[PDB]
Amino acid sequence: SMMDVDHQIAKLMVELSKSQDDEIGDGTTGVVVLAGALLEEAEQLLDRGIHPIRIADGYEQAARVAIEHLDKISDSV
């Protein structure tokens, strides 16, 4: 929020972190690192010639898998 960005993708990342803060109030730095990493890997996938939408769909699928696995390994307090 304090960062003076002019790149619209940096603005999207600012909005992402603010969204994590609104919904949760923690994780505001993990979300940005994780999204950056996902795009960094999409970079190699696009280099190999995959359609960016296929990348987005594989990411959605894997995200569903990870969410259910979190529900699975979760603990209660």
Partner: protein, 213 residues
Amino acid sequence: ASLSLAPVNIFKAGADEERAETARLTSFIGAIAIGDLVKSTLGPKGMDKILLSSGRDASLMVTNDGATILKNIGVDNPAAKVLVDMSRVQDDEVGDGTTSVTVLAAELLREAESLIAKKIHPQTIIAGWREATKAAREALLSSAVDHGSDEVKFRQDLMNIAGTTLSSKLLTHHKDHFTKLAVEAVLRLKGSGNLEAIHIIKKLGGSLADSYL
């Protein structure tokens, strides 16, 4: 990669982003500049500074008070701003120690620069500094002495503390005189801490020893 040294710049015209070594560089040089500024006013033989403001009035001040000196300077380094605010907070909490705290912070940051040069993480440094702060707090508390019970010994401690506070300042010329003043002025409050109660009228003329309570 990096935020600034990237093929695309991600910032508005006029912004900037100092990274790891450059950030510690600016921080340490600014803090150490502030500290080297405010020292030489430290101790009985400390000398004063001139605060020749450049405003349309060109206010002129001659001070040995670290809080005033730091308040009245145009700082642009953020770490220097941190130290400035720290001295202001010292002046608010108690009325002394603004130069001792400023010099101490600056020397700690100098030593931290040295340690970072030794290829040490500033987390191991902050951890060790917290441990050292604990040890120092206990040593201080253990060495502290209390004499508020004995009324005469308390009067002696009050006179000695007032003398030690005025020793560094321009009043060390007539320290004893002003020492008595300050002590009486604080004893006339009868336990109250209201310093707004103590009015000080500054009348031009006469010698500094003509001052009285």
